[PDB]
Structure formats: C-alpha cells, structure tokens
C-alpha cells in the first residue's frame, strides 16, 4: 500500500517475483525515478 | 616546498564536480552509476545541454541497457540541486523545473504544462493567435507567462569562475589633441649571471620604448577620430623599424594596449586594402552594415538586397552577396525573418 513500504527494497530482492520481468523493473523504475527517486532506504517506523 | 602558503591550489568546484558528488550520494546500482558518470560528463557549464542522447545509449556499447534505463535515470539525475539539470531543449527544462510548483499555485500548473510542454514555439513573438488556442484571455495567461519568464536558465549558479579575467592593461594612450599620445605606463658563476641581467636591464627600459615607438606609428597609421580605424597594413609598421611582420603582431598579440575606447590592440593594425579606388576595410563595412541594419525594417522588410543597394550607394562596390552575408553574420536577423 502507498509508497514507503514499496520504496525499500533492493532489485535483486524485487527481480525474482512472479509476472515483473526486466521490463516491469524499469517501469517502475521510470514512473518512480520522478518525485521520490529513492528505491531504497531503512528508514524508521510507521505510523499505520 | 612547504610551510608556507605555495600557488598549491584551491580546489574548487564546479558544476560537473557537483553533480558528480551528488551522484555518489544517491541509491544507484553498480550499472546505473555508470549511467549517472556517463550523463554528468555530458553536461555543460550552461546547464541545459546534454547533447545526444542515443550517442549516451550507444556509448555503452549495447549487451542491452535500452534506452528507458538511460531516460529514467537521467530523470533523476535532472532532478538534483540546482533544480533544472540538464535534460535538453530548454523545454523539457522548463517542465522539470516547473515540475515542483508545490502544485497550491493558482492558475499556474495546468496552464503552465499547456504552455511550457507544447506551442512554446509561437509564445517567442506574443501571445496573439495562441491566445484562442488555449481559449484563454486577459491577465490569466499573462499571469502564467510571468511565472514561465519568472523562471531562469538552467544551472550557471555553480559557476565557479570568481575569476573575472582582467586585462590589466600595457601602454596607456593619454588622449592629446582629438586623438593618442603614448606613454607606456604601469660565487663568480653568478655574479657572470648578474651581468646577463645588466644587458635585461638595458632591455626593460627599451621595453617601454617600443611600446611608445611602435604606439605612435600604430597613431600615425590609423585615425582616432574617424569612423572605426583607417585600413593599414602590417607592411607599415614593418616599414619604420624594418621588423618582421610575424614578430610585431606577436607583439600586439600578447601584449594589449589600452587607449580611451577599447582595451583590442592586434585588431588596430590587422586590415584589408579593399582592391578598390573608391575607398575602412571590412571594419566599418560590417560595423556599419549592422548600424545601418540596426535602423532599417519599419515591420519585417528582412531585405538584404536594400541593404546591399545601400552600401553600392556609398561607393564601396557591393557583390549583393559578399556584403549581405558579412552583413547578416554575427545574430543579425537581416535575412532570417523573411
């Protein structure tokens, strides 16, 4: 759900799911490369 | 040596040095930093340019890598500090830039994208027929086009040139009666050396001499007060002292006077003879072919040829092609807006 949650994992951990591909990888990697740029950090909590 | 402050250095940045330690800070994998130092190369101390892009795809030499893995990352990499980086065509510079608006700007997103994104092209001019493109009226669009004018360049903030490049001047020419008068201003193995520096210090005070000697044949040769500078060539100054030519246009090439108007020294004997009897060079053939062209085109008369006609009025011997293409160089728009 949302974003953070999305946004920590590294591709090595991503690559290997079922349907993605190489070329879903980039595709979020084109869509989320704007705005928050991040794909990855620990950061701290959440709040929900 | 050391402990003292020696020319070592400063280490500065600039713009590439930046966005490279930016780079080095940013969640890159071990490929798409190559991408990333691949693009940070590519750009300019203009910002904008990023020059090709499938000479940047193609550069790593294929064994895939398409190009969206190129696109995204160099997105990201135009996202970085001085906000607008890069991209390319100033248009998709104004899009990045005008991509954080906070999006609580009145008025601003929409038509911002609308203008910025498509039909800049015509917004060059005036508004006018893009006026009724976009169904817009009064102060709304210009409002939108005060924040697109609002908005700069590129980067050029990075900068990194505190060093404005004086030009310190030479010889100083002390303007006399309506024209220049020169002044020129501003154990026993080394004791042998002290004797090659009495024959340098004979010839530093010649130094001067030649420069107030070959300044006033240089006064002598060209006018002051006339339209740009008498034609001369480097056979008369080759004449009074019998100097080579190579040797005294290295002179005036280093070495840069400074008279009244212009600081410009190799430029006051470099000429042509113009191979005519009815007549200052090409020096006051473009000068004025653009002062003449400066007034001229009461809307868009873009003629050349009027020009041409203008300077065979003069006396000058115009070719209509020779004298319009001298005349149209240096972003005069003579000859574009037709």
């Known amino acids: 759900h949302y974003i953070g949650d999305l946004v920590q994992r590294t591709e090595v951990e991503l690559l290997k799911t079922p349907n993605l591909g190489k070329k879903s990888l980039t595709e979020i990697k084109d869509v989320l490369a704007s705005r928050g740029l991040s794909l990855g950090m620990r950061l701290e909590n959440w709040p929900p | 040596d050391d402990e003292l402050p020696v020319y070592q250095g400063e280490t500065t940045q600039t713009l590439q040095d930046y966005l490279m330690w930016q780079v080095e800070l940013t969640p890159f994998t071990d490929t798409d930093r190559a991408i990333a130092t691949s693009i940070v190369d590519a750009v300019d101390d203009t910002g904008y340019l990023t020059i090709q892009i499938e000479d940047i795809v193609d550069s790593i030499g294929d064994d895939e ?19 607008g980086v890069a991209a390319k065509d100033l248009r998709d510079c104004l899009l990045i830039q005008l991509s954080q608006f906070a999006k609580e700007t009145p008025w601003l997103e929409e038509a911002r994208l609308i203008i910025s994104d498509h039909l800049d092209l015509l917004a060059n001019h005036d508004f006018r027929t893009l006026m009724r493109v976009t169904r817009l009226k009064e102060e709304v669009l210009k409002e939108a086009v005060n924040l697109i004018q609002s908005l700069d360049x590129x980067x050029x903030x990075x900068x990194x040139x505190x060093x404005x490049x004086x030009x310190x001047x030479x010889x100083x020419x002390x303007x006399x009666x309506x024209x220049x008068x020169x002044x020129x201003x501003x154990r026993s193995n080394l004791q042998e050396a002290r004797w ?63 008279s009244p108007r212009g600081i410009x020294x190799x430029x006051x004997x470099x000429x042509x003879x113009x191979x005519x009897x009815x007549x200052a060079s090409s020096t006051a ?36 092609r020779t004298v319009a293409k001298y005349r149209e160089s240096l ?8």
């Open chain 2, 196 to 258: 090659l520096i009495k024959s340098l210090e004979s010839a530093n005070d010649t130094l001067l001499r030649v420069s107030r000697c070959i300044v006033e044949q240089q006064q002598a040769f060209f006018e002051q007060g006339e339209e740009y500078m008498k034609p001369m060539v480097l056979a008369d100054i080759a004449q009074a002292v019998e100097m080579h030519e190579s040797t005294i246009s290295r002179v005036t090439t280093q070495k840069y006077l400074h």
């Open chain 2, 65 to 83: 890598i398409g190009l969206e893995e190129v696109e995204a990352v160099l997105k990201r990499i135009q996202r970085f500090d001085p906000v």
């Open chain 2, 285 to 320: 053939i473009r000068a004025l072919v653009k002062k003449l062209i400066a007034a001229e085109n009461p809307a868009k008369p873009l003629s050349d040829s009027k020009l041409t006609s203008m300077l065979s009025e003069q006396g000058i011997m115009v070719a209509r």
């Open chain 2, 331 to 338: 972003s005069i728009p003579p000859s574009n807006q037709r």
